[PDB]
Amino acid sequence: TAHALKDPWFLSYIPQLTPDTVKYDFKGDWNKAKQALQQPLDYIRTVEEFWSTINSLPKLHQLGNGSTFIFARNNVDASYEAFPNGTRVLVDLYKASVAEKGMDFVLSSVLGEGLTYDVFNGKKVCDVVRLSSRPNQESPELVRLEVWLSDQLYAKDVIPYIRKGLNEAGLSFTDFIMGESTF
């Protein structure tokens, strides 16, 4: 009937979340801007819900610069403070079209627990996936995906697995760039 995910995931939206907008809100306090700007969207509990939610998301680049979608395992807080020995595997997707093929690969791999059994040996290292509109002068449709890891030790294994998966999803070397930002 309804095919339950290993864990439910909470989907949230932060409109035009830029490092400059946190000046309008409390200077230091991130929690203030978060409580103010963040909108809840969906609670994804099943595979059927996952695909309706994914295949019904508004295009990131068509929402303003800095606009962010957050998928949080068991409704956890997507804050860097929550994962002290953690990191975030970055994927920059240059076109709007490739960002769609890339998001499908990464979200199915994470929420579908592909990463868990292929890279983490059954451990739930990933609890957050973030997607944001990050245009630049050269790339107006630029989208950033972030795969947050509980432990940095797995990043060196997550980067080639995601890269191979993206190349297998039909993305070339120029379609995306792999990155890493520690916590």
UniProtKB/TrEMBL annotation:
Name the UniProt record assigns to this protein: Putative Eukaryotic translation initiation factor 4E type 5
UniProt similarity note: Belongs to the eukaryotic initiation factor 4E family.
Signal peptide start-end: none
SUPFAM superfamilies cross-referenced by the UniProt entry: eIF4e-like
Residues passing through the membrane, by range: none
GO CC terms: eukaryotic translation initiation factor 4F complex
Keyword RNA-binding found: yes
Entry keyword Protein biosynthesis: yes
Any Pfam family the entry gives: IF4E
GO molecular function annotations of the record: RNA 7-methylguanosine cap binding; translation initiation factor activity
Keywords assigned: Initiation factor, Protein biosynthesis, RNA-binding
Domain of life: Eukaryota
